[PDB]
Amino acid sequence: INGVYYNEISRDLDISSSTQCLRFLKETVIPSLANNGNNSTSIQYHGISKNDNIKKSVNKLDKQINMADRSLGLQQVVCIFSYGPHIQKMLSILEIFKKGYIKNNKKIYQWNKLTSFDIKREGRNELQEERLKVPILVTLVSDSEIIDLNLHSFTKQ
Template identity: 40%
Template sequence: MTDAQVLFNENSTELALDNHTQTLQYIQDAVIPNMLGPLDVSIDHYLKVNKNNNIKKSVRRTLRSLSDSASTLCIYSYGKHIQKLLSILQITSARLPKGTKLQQWNKLSSFTQIKHKHGNELIDDKITIPIFITVVTTGDAQLDPLYSAKFTKQ
């Protein structure tokens, strides 16, 4: 029998990673602001991605969010859901109107899940769960400050 504790930046979060809604909301409320720090970057829309998202609907929503060239969209996920996020980004990029360039900045962070052992087990298991944040726009939004927050331009 094990108990699991989830940490972000070495602080306990009270999260259960299998509760996707709670975890994704925590990422939007706590992780993204932490990653952006004091930067003056305006995020107009957020898209939470988990393995249950319908790719077609997510691509449509992403394209709709990016239809205003001044709009900035933050797409994020964690763990096993990141692959679906990457698929949505790839398809969105391919479906943009001709001549429209997608500007994308990425950053990785992580949760640490500690499984506390009981009985004869002496060592706790530590598992690193990746968190992927990407900020995209099709316009001239001034997102260069993301460089100082260690985001990587794609």
């Protein structure tokens, strides 16, 4: 990998190291798609890697959905994000949480977004360069139907 590009802008990231890319996703791509200032939402960020325990992740997630106080009128949304091959484990943990939560006669409303990092490698020859794309899946799950967030570019599920 020679360089990492997002939104036609070069960034200083590394695909093999998960911490830097997860912090970049938490700090840049989420504020560029959702704004927590003009509304009354409590957003809980969570990134999933492939070395995380599924049961511990679910035990963190079922707590992160009931952290804010309910009396003042706060809508609590938890945004899970991952990239690359860790998206499989992310989906597994999301589906296990859905299975373990929907059993209590409740519903989880979900919004999905898919973007891409643009990385560059040196081709077979010395005069060729290949451009690879790494997928980025960001999901927002909440118990309430309507959210005042800018969710026009998401997918209602």
